[PDB]
Amino acid sequence: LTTFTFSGLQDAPVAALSGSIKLNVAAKAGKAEVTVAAGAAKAATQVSAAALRKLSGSKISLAEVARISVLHSSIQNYLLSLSNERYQLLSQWPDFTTMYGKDFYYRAHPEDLKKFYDAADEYYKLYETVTEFDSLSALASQVVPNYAARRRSTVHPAIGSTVADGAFTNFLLSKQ
Amino acid sequence: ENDVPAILKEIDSLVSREAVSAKEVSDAAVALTYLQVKANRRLWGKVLEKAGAAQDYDAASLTNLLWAINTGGVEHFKTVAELAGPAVSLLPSLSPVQLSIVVEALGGAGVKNYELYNKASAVVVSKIGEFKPAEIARVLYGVAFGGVNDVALAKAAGKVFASTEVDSRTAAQALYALAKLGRADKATVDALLKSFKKGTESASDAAAASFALGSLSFKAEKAIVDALKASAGDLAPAQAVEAAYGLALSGATDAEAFKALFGVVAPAIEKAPDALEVSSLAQLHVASTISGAKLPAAVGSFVAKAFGLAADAARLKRSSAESALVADVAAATAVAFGAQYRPEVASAVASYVKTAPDGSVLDIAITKGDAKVLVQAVPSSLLTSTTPAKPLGHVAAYSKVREAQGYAVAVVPANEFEALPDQKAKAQYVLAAIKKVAPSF
Amino acid sequence: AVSKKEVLYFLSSKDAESSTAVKSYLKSLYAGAQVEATETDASELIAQLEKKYLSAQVVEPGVHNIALPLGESGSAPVKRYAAELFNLGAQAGFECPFIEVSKKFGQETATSETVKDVLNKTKSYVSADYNAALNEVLSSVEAEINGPVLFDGKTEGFKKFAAKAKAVAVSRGLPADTILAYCAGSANEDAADKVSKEFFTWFESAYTADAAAEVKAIEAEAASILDRHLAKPVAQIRKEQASAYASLLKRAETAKGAKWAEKYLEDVKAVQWFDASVAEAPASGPKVAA
Amino acid sequence: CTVITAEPLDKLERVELTKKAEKFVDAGFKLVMQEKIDKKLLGGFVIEFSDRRVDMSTAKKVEEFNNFVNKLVLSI
Amino acid sequence: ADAKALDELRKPKFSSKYLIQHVSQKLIPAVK
Amino acid sequence: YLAPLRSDFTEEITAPKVASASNLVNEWNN
């Protein structure tokens, strides 16, 4: 934020929109008698007109605690959201355990039964490797150095093809 | 029957579930700002996490949330700059009061979204009569701090501030917007200055008014300073620093006002020396040097050293169309002091770069024995965006703090350095500018 | 131990370990310590080398604090990501990316007089799909003139080359007239603002398409990495990752006495602390002193 | 001799240049210092004696600068 | 111990910053 | 989880090389 903000008791929200937390104020001349209810606990206090102005005096500056970095955690979140899209189609695998009985063993061709047991072991391999979730934090470090050296540019971190092409028109089409 | 921590626990358990939608997020944040909960960081963090996660947004909930982010003094640039999806997508649905709240609260966080600010400015200047003066002041604040140099909305705001009457807070907000825009227009600043007459209800209005007058370099107002002197205990130290800096840039002689301004800052620096930014400690040293009001022992020398650090950091991170200007002006200064060929010019340019006593590096500093001079180039960033194009208040700030070091600052501004034909004419202008300060050189 | 030019870059920086070093330095200056003399030497080659190797020290903690908008729908998180890269470039000392790549163009071909060597010395800094579309236009002007068309501005061959190059530029999709009328300036503030708003509209779409292309590259790399990883049985994955982790530990463990080695091992100790602290109470996150 | 520079030579620059180029003759010989212009040099001078050469230009200086940097960074 | 700090926990961990610092410390005196 | 630290700069400005779609969705549906 900036160092001087100008919000409080002026075009302010005066009533709640949710049924889960019930807030209400008293818009008087200067002051405000708020009452807020969130379940069985209740608070009904009073804020002054110069009491919301000093709220933005100290800045909160919310900053994230990550395991490695916010970059690595965002890449790992994407890899987990890809593992979920694979896992949702491993969820639709047809139940082969209903055909494990010996009334399907001796009815079927030997080669087709060997193929069927190979297919069941293949499902167990796919399912045990799609739920190795602690390997995503090591896969996400195989995207980090190439990307982070892309942003270690001599020109600018935010540079790309389109901005450099537009400025190459501006450089070329102006004289010399 | 009236408790803060138990309802904090219930609001914490509200946003800690799985599938909280927009309205409960908004009303949780609104209730958190009405309960003044700066001391609790993690509950605010839960609220901003679920504020980033909620995908539906109506106009009222996005407006309540951005109001809560703004008056709560909470910044997290990711979740605020990601809130602009609901701001651009729900732009026709917004009422102009809610449009004012969303544009102000996204402007304050430095959100760089040109589609949002262009589409908000087009809405305001296409239908201007549907807006209160507070609403145009807030939209002007939002577009001013969002990196847009929108001058059409500045003119459309200046029209309404010319015809109609504003409050104290509204005028302070629009002055702060025009001061970051760099406007200095008398037909608008003088129209907003007549609102600071019936008193300022809070100190931050007067602080931003004094800072906007300092950074636009107008005058003192004789009523903003007294309304600021009766309330200089309300402000955070980085607010009273900017107030005293804007007052000393505006020529203030009130010793008691500067005493009350420094009475919150200097104990805050003595409690925590690091808590304020180095640019803010530089602003404090500027305000201490021009006004001449005193600080304690370990504060005045400390902020002098911090001004040396900040002048060096402004030297290293130059605009490189400013370093070309410093090279040009140093070449013209070496020509004007007598050099008709390239090697004398180059050696004198490389020998004009004597250093200041506080630790900084001066580009063009000449010492003829006991008399010192300084030449400083004012490129484009420190020039006013209107048609006089006079230099801003930071120019006079650096000038008046170098002048108390033993120097004589001769301003060479690039509006009056670029329109000349050759290096002889530029040498003539730099020589006339040095002679206009101290004719002993 | 800051070296008085490193700390001058970290004054406007906003990340953690730079601002903590600045806070320790400013508490050193509060306890009556003198500031070193800023060195006015080291002519412009060493100056731009120190700038290049010092803005990287502000960019590299800053990139790892900027979360990618991977898998997101909409142009709002892409604009958040590009805006955070802009604020990072401004904290590190760079200017606007338009101004910085224009400065790279003016620094690259300052001593070239033909358009062909401008296109051969600005080859890396433009795309190949644009350099070919300019090289064919240059070859056509060479067929029209049978003389090297010079890059002057007063030479008429450059004018009839630019009259085709503007059509090339607008057919690529970028309005060359809006860009040229922005970067040339205008008479009054109204007709300057009318083209400033349109250049910022193009520029916003330009960096947004840039960040979106970068995010699509990371998304395709993450999909390829995962689809190559999900084809392995679990024991192969576990032995490969234990081998990679142990080898990259010992690559930092052999080198001892450097700053990056002890910083790497302090980071592994901090990661193991994070795993322990999330183990002690897992429904409330890690323990932060408050 | 033959000197090739980036700019037309100045009447203190020329005295310093003929002052420097008299070091490179290994005798008490004279020298008909010739002048030539090349904007591809970024300043400096190249003294061509037709059997000797010094290159105190800025072009070879920045080339040697980039080469020493690129050779040093791969060894650190 | 537990509950370290916030400003100690805002550090991006395996960023480079110190290979860059190592090269800038072993290059700049040697190029000067 | 730890990565090789690299200290190198990218001088050129290229398009970021969007890699090809792998066949894992088709192979697992097969």
XYZ file of N, CA and C in Angstrom, chain C residues 20 64 70 97 110 115 122 149 173 180 191 202 210 217 228 240 243 262-263 266 269:
63
model
N 17.154 -7.835 5.386
C 17.717 -8.117 6.702
C 19.165 -7.644 6.790
N 12.422 -16.139 -7.281
C 11.954 -17.255 -6.479
C 10.903 -16.857 -5.456
N 0.496 -20.858 -12.999
C 0.406 -22.090 -13.760
C -0.998 -22.659 -13.665
N 10.911 -2.326 -19.687
C 11.510 -3.270 -20.642
C 11.548 -2.766 -22.064
N 25.195 0.912 -32.822
C 25.503 2.334 -32.850
C 26.481 2.670 -33.967
N 21.286 -1.263 -43.201
C 20.181 -1.910 -42.502
C 20.467 -3.394 -42.329
N 21.397 -7.108 -34.453
C 20.266 -7.249 -33.542
C 19.538 -8.557 -33.781
N 21.257 -0.457 -49.165
C 20.398 0.597 -48.640
C 20.907 1.006 -47.263
N 0.950 -7.703 -36.219
C -0.074 -7.481 -35.219
C 0.188 -6.317 -34.297
N 5.241 4.639 -32.594
C 6.084 5.740 -33.045
C 5.555 7.083 -32.561
N -3.528 15.167 -27.113
C -3.141 14.271 -28.193
C -1.888 13.470 -27.873
N -1.450 -1.486 -26.036
C -0.618 -2.444 -26.759
C 0.449 -3.049 -25.860
N 3.674 -12.117 -23.502
C 5.004 -12.616 -23.152
C 4.962 -13.531 -21.934
N 5.110 -22.388 -21.661
C 6.330 -23.187 -21.742
C 6.568 -23.978 -20.465
N 6.831 -38.213 -18.190
C 7.998 -39.078 -18.199
C 8.252 -39.685 -16.831
N 16.329 -42.943 -8.135
C 16.815 -41.821 -8.932
C 16.797 -40.528 -8.133
N 19.460 -40.600 -5.445
C 20.763 -40.387 -6.066
C 20.979 -38.925 -6.418
N 27.861 -23.007 2.535
C 27.238 -22.906 3.846
C 25.802 -22.416 3.744
N 25.479 -21.602 2.734
C 24.099 -21.162 2.565
C 23.211 -22.302 2.095
N 22.751 -24.537 5.187
C 21.813 -23.881 6.095
C 20.396 -23.934 5.550
N 19.130 -27.425 6.284
C 18.719 -27.441 7.688
C 17.402 -26.703 7.908
